[PDB]
């Protein structure tokens, strides 16, 4: 080590991000840090609702008898899939909504079950976050054309063992969806927070942004997207009010001169980056520690 700099100040962070100890004069884009705790907002059209609970039970116990080996692999495994009636084929979901639940039913201490993604495009616990399907069926035996999800038995500070797998089949579509769990009291159709950075799921579109009320009286549709596919706004189907969506931290532009930051172009009224004076230009706001009396 010859010399070091801590990435603590605003100029130091720019130097660290640019991977260089010196920065040439010019303009450099940067993004403010995102809030670390985000509320959740959900908007959804009410549809014909019936709810199926997919539940997977895992239990195992050791070989009772003269040899009590704890670290050994479990021998006998009970794995059930609720309503999965063997000969009838995979347990398919017919309901519009469904929820996946996991019941780690082992009693031995320090032993815990788990399920892994495998080669499926989704995870067991993560389907509940409003994932759409055209069809989906689970089974404890291989489905021709499906995917496999390993089921594992774990011991603390010890190596784990596979104790089976869950086979899934699916197709793309908009008819079936996964939800976390019904709770009596909460409206899953229009429950949003305004002017605060929030994580949202609005009419099957997930993202992070800020929601506000706006002018627009657009008559067609319920969602409005940009060329890139990002969601720019949506309409509450009851009132007809249209809400806009803005990113939580759009990029700024810092001005550096003589190895220091002298100004910053901003999109709003704030004395950001520690500058004590802010003015307004035709297209943007400008903040700097300047006295505004120079000529060159």
């Amino acid at each position: 080590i010859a010399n070091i700099i801590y990435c603590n100040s605003v100029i130091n962070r720019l130097r660290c991000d640019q991977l260089s100890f010196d920065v040439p004069d010019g303009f450099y884009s940067t993004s403010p840090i995102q809030p670390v705790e985000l509320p959740v907002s959900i908007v959804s059209l009410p549809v014909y609702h019936k709810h199926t609970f997919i539940v997977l039970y895992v239990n195992f116990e050791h070989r009772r008898g003269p040899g009590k080996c704890y670290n050994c692999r479990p021998a006998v495994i009970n794995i059930t899939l609720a309503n999965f009636n063997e000969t009838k084929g995979p347990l398919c979901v017919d309901t519009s909504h469904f929820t996946t639940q996991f019941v780690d039913n082992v009693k031995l201490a320090r032993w815990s079950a788990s399920i892994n993604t495998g080669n499926c495009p989704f995870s067991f616990g993560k389907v509940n976050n409003f994932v759409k399907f055209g069809s989906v069926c689970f089974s404890l035996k291989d489905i021709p054309g499906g995917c496999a999800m390993p089921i594992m038995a774990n011991l603390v500070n010890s190596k784990s063992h596979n104790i089976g797998s869950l086979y899934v089949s699916w197709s793309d579509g908009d008819v079936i969806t996964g939800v976390p769990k019904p709770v009596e009291g909460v409206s899953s159709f229009m429950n949003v927070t305004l002017n605060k950075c929030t994580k949202y799921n609005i009419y099957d579109v997930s993202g992070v942004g800020v929601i506000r009320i706006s002018n627009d009286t657009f008559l067609n549709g319920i969602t409005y997207t940009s060329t890139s596919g990002n969601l720019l706004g949506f309409k509450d189907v009851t009132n007809g009010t249209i809400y806009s969506i803005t990113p939580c931290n759009p990029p700024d532009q810092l001005v550096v001169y003589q190895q220091a930051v002298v100004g910053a172009m901003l999109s709003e009224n704030f004395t950001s980056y520690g500058f004590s004076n802010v003015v307004e230009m035709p297209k943007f706001f400008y903040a700097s520690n300047g006295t505004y009396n120079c000529t060159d």
């Epitope: 996991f102 780690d104 009693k107 815990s112 769990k181």
Partner: antibody, heavy 124, light 106 residues
Framework: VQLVESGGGLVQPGGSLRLSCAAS????????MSWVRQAPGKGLEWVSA????????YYADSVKGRFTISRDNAKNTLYLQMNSLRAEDTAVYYC????????????????????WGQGTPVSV | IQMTQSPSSLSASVGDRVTITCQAS??????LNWYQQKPGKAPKLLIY???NLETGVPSRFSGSGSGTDFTLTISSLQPEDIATYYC?????????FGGGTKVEIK
């Protein structure tokens, strides 16, 4: 690993309290927690337990319907809500940590507490 | 579920071979914990699964049993072991502790 309880005191019968227990030194959301009380000069009695996620909560019959367990995984804090207290509810309350780590998407067994708090007195 | 431990109290000389039992009044198979509470302090876990010795307690302790009968033994009772011992089952999530048992030196 460390557990510290707080919120003990003296309240009239029929009152309410806000027992709290902070946790540090381990991944808090991976382990189930339970409150267990020791009446003065008596054996330990289990009061309530909550899994890591919080979907499942269990209560003993001597406390069923009167108390309410909760946990806030964002700031490693375990809570116990006491309502409609009686005379026999007076004891020292400990917050305990299970020994089996479990995935956050799972609901499972518990009962092998390896770490215990200092305990706090509650008088009525 | 109910648990009963015998004896309710006992006293033995240093280096002796104290043995304390616990019974479950119901088939518990192997799900039993053994705790130790020194006076005025929080309990500590000694044995889990009725026989698995914990990683921070000396091998002086040992536990055995199955079904309805269980037993905890101290190979050589040292002066540090004066405390109250408890057995706790976890076959049912509405778990219950025993009444305890106290040891004494002479």
């Amino acid at each position: 690993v460390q557990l510290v309880e707080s919120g003990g005191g003296l309240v009239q019968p029929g009152g309410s309290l806000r027992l709290s227990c902070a946790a540090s030194g381990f991944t808090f959301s991976s382990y189930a927690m339970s409150w267990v009380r020791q009446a003065p000069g008596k054996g330990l009695e289990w009061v309530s337990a909550i899994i890591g996620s919080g979907s499942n909560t269990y209560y003993a019959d001597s406390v069923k319907g009167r108390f309410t367990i909760s946990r806030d995984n964002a700031k490693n804090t375990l809570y116990l809500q006491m309502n409609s207290l009686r005379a026999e509810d007076t004891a020292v309350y400990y917050c305990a940590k299970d020994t089996t780590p479990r995935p956050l998407y799972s609901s499972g067994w518990y009962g092998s507490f390896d770490y215990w708090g200092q305990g706090t007195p509650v008088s009525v | 579920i109910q648990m009963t431990q015998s004896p309710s109290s006992l006293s033995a000389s240093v280096g002796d071979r104290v043995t304390i039992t616990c019974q479950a009044s119901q088939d518990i198979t192997t799900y039993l914990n053994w705790y130790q509470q020194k006076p005025g302090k929080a309990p500590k876990l000694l044995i889990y699964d009725a026989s698995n010795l914990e990683t921070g307690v000396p091998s002086r302790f040992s536990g055995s049993g199955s079904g309805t009968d269980f037993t905890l033994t101290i190979s050589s009772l040292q002066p540090e072991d004066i405390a109250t011992y408890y057995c706790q089952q976890y076959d049912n999530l509405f778990l219950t502790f025993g009444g305890g048992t106290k040891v004494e030196i002479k």
